[PDB]
Point group: C3
Chain length 180, copies 3
């Protein structure tokens, strides 16, 4: 039933190993799964962009504290949030609070606003020209977003794992990025 | 749609900053939110009453243990539940178990019993004369309960925060209640 | 309404102390409760069987690690999973991952497959002859499964509690099984 939905493309086609959509799956279940997948993909895309920017030597100009702790002095990766040399716990809690405010008020599907598909948070408020695209281009953009999100999920998991296995003696000369 | 419901009164009117009810919000969502708000308000009202009674020097007569630990020897506030001089862990676990029994059996909206609104746990079992009040008086009582609950939420949050910031050097001469 | 459902047997009859099905309880709520009860019963039956087999001196032949840690060297009970002499954390995490894979993909009620009642995971895939039984025998088998599951819930709780109270000085010469 969902073998022709978004995300079922070449070369794998419809790829449902664990069988979430097996049987007479309801549209609500697939909508929930696609919402979770798109949310994870967007978060992972942002996380991968952040690690790429930070690890390349690009840091915000200034100090993260009144104490003078410069932005470009903190480590990259999980060591920047959780560790002995991480950013202050106040900064992490404020970041989490901002993300929670976004979750509750901003990055949500408001019913009866004009949203067209799962993951559309536009809400008739912030539109950059979605209606300019025709249907085929719209589907292509949605598929690109979803697949880049899956790739970012895998990449961010790999980056965190590789950073975490370095103290254990598992230091890998990763391609392109190099040593973490 | 919910701008004329209970709790939207002077001077703020309908106050929905985070936009929980924005858009075509369903009645189920508002009922869930109002249930959570009323439950929190009742819990916080009881918590503030407990704070006032305990901090005023009124303690239960006797001892909380067979070992002879008197009721009036334990501290007030968070130090009475979680701390080195708190009540015995068995007492806290029994309190939590009693509250869970209440949650699962007593303080619940039993369907098909005669409940009139969200937060009405009466269940046609314990009534002190609710039907004696007229509709306007009923609405006034419900609004009083809700607003006192919100005030108690903020007050209990303030009391816990002020108790917790005292060891950090943030001791404030609070009005009325004084030093915690 | 649910006083004649499965699980209401002599001598207790319909036993609903906490009043979970009191009032106009929907079939969905009873179905959820029965699903949870059957799942817990099956898990507890497996846990009791495994703990009895392990405590009887029957262990898998070989070693659980490449390091040579034999199966019959680990303790019995909670000390085998969580403790200073437990199985390796890798083994526990892999067991949890296998159970999660089962939860997600295998031990589930796939809609539109032919399942006849709550707790039926057969899904028209693995059938040993369920249709051979008549209606009364089917009800008897389901009731036996449910009641043995409740008995196993109590038994596994008792086994874990008795194992945990031994270091505290509460060592009980339990009947049949003896000292844990
Ligand atoms: C998962 C996302 C994520 C997370 C958790 C972090 C976390 C962190 N970043 Mg970071 N970053 C990210 C994405 C992320 N970043 C992206 C995508 C970029 C590229 C622009 C950067 C660029 C960046 C720089 C240049 C620096 C950091 C730094 C830091 C650290 C200090 C916090 C700070 O100043 O943030 C700053 C965050 C930003 C500048 C960009 C955040 C953008 C977010 C993800 C937007 C997402 C919500 C957005 C409002 C949605 C808009 C919707 C639209 C319709 C309006 C902290 C560990 C600093 C550091 O290393 O100090 C220790 C630092 O110097 N980051
Ligand atoms: C558990 C906490 C809690 C919850 C769930 C609610 C829930 C609600 N409040 Mg409320 N409120 C609370 C605490 C809470 N309140 C406290 C402590 C105060 C005192 C400052 C108020 C003061 C208040 C006013 C003055 C009004 C509401 C209103 C509302 C309703 C819609 C507004 C909204 O976006 O929700 C509140 C926000 C959240 C749930 C987001 C929480 C994110 C963290 C909703 C039923 C409005 C209403 O009843 O209109 C019909 C309204 O006018 N509230
Ligand atoms: C959030 C609610 C709450 C919580 C968590 C606590 C927690 C505590 N209180 Mg306390 N207390 C509360 C509310 C609360 N109280 C209220 C509202 C009052 C005013 C009557 C008191 C009066 C009070 C005294 C006088 C003493 C305590 C003490 C204590 C401590 C020991 C436990 C004990 O003996 O409880 C005793 C609890 C009570 C005497 C009253 C509890 C009543 C609860 C809130 C009823 C709520 C559910 C109820 C069944 C609903 C009925 C619905 C109706 C339709 C039937 C413990 C830290 C003792 C202490 O400090 O020793 C260490 C102590 O001496 N409390
Ligand atoms: C995971 C544990 C669990 C769960 C979810 C249930 C769930 C249920 N049991 Mg049950 N039961 C259990 C363990 C459990 N049982 C055990 C261990 C025993 C043996 C002591 C029993 C013995 C038992 C009897 C004798 C009866 C039930 C009945 C019921 C049903 C309604 C009674 C009720 O309020 O629920 C049970 C209570 C809770 C879920 C509250 C838990 C709060 C902590 C419901 C499907 C009745 C039934 O099937 O009627 C149709 C019935 O007559 N149960
Ligand atoms: C709650 C269930 C449960 C749990 C958590 C454990 C946990 C454990 N068992 Mg164990 N065991 C169980 C049930 C369980 N067992 C049952 C039911 C039996 C009887 C066959 C055994 C027999 C057994 C032996 C003989 C040994 C262990 C050992 C161990 C320990 C090492 C892990 C291992 O080798 O597993 C091995 C697990 C098994 C041999 C059987 C597990 C079978 C599971 C329960 C199947 C459940 C799902 C299944 C696929 C459903 C199929 C449905 C069907 C339609 C296809 C570990 C603490 C070993 C030990 O103590 O070394 C430290 C050991 O030597 N167990
Ligand atoms: C004005 C304003 O405020 O906002 C607007 C601005 C604008 C532009 C309109 C908006 C937008 C669009 C945005 C932000 C789009 C972002 C898209 C983004 C960020 C897309 C890539 C993600 C990451 C991927 C694919 C990672 C793959 C990672 C992969 C495939 C790996 O496995 C990788 C790997 O590393 C390992 C682990 C090991 C090494 O071998 C190295 C490599 C690399 C191989 C917003 C959102 O509307 C907000
Ligand atoms: C027979 C039996 O068993 O039961 C029946 C008995 C009976 C009577 C019928 C029943 C009832 C009704 C009850 C229990 C009603 C209770 C109502 C209650 C308990 C109502 C106030 C709450 C707290 C508020 C408003 C706090 C505000 C706190 C505020 C506004 C603050 O911010 C405060 C502040 O402190 C700071 C943090 C700093 C300092 O500057 C000091 C102050 C104070 C300014 C029940 C429930 O049906 C059960
Ligand atoms: C081919 C393949 O791969 O799979 C198939 C194989 C097969 C056979 C078809 C299948 C099956 C059926 C199975 C596995 C059925 C299992 C049934 C099972 C395991 C049934 C008892 C549970 C435990 C009870 C009742 C415990 C009570 C415990 C009680 C009553 C206590 O309180 C006890 C106690 O200890 C205390 C705490 C203290 C002491 O005084 C000692 C005692 C004992 C008194 C499956 C599932 O379809 C999978
Ligand atoms: C996530 C987004 C975000 C938002 C929306 C946001 C809003 C506000 C507002 C509201 C207008 C104020 C008034 C405010 C004030 C301060 N912020 Mg924010 N802040 C955010 C993020 C961070 C991070 C990451 C850090 C940080 C800090 C500080 C410090 C320094 C305190 C000090 O130096 O003792 C002060 C005074 C740093 C800190 O925590 O220092 C321990 C630091 O690391 N903030 N901040
Ligand atoms: C929340 C409500 C509540 C209920 C409904 C409830 C019911 C019962 C019943 C059932 C009829 C019994 C039989 C019972 C028995 C004991 N209770 Mg309760 N008890 C409640 C609350 C507390 C608190 C707060 C404490 C406490 C204690 C004890 C001790 C002392 C043990 C000891 O001194 O070794 C014993 C023997 C104290 C304790 O935990 O001491 C470590 C203590 O702090 N109990 N209790
Ligand atoms: C729950 C079911 C389950 C499944 C489905 C499953 C699948 C696979 C697969 C996939 C085909 C591989 C390739 C694989 C391989 C290894 N397993 Mg499994 N394994 C399961 C259970 C356990 C347990 C309980 C233990 C264990 C272990 C090891 C070790 C030893 C590593 C070492 O000696 O360093 C290796 C190499 C032991 C261990 O973790 O040792 C620290 C141990 O305790 N495994 N295992």
């Amino acid at each position: 039933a969902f073998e022709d939905e978004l995300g079922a493309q070449a070369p794998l086609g419809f790829f449902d190993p664990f069988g979430m959509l097996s049987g007479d799956c309801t549209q609500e279940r697939f909508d929930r799964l696609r919402y979770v997948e798109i949310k994870h993909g967007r978060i992972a895309q942002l996380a991968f962009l952040g690690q790429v920017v930070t690890r390349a030597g690009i840091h915000l100009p200034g100090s993260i504290n009144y104490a003078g702790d410069s932005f470009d002095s903190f480590p990259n990766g999980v060591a920047a949030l959780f560790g002995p040399n991480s950013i202050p716990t106040a900064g992490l809690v404020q970041i989490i609070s901002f993300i929670g405010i976004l979750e509750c008020a901003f990055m949500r599907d408001v019913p009866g606003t004009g949203n067209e598909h799962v993951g559309d948070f536009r809400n008739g408020y912030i539109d950059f020209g979605w209606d300019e695209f025709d249907e085929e281009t719209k589907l292509s953009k949605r598929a690109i977003e979803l697949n880049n999100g899956r790739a970012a999920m895998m990449g961010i998991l790999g980056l965190m794992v590789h950073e975490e296995i370095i103290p254990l003696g598992y230091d890998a000369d990763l391609p392109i990025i190099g040593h973490l």
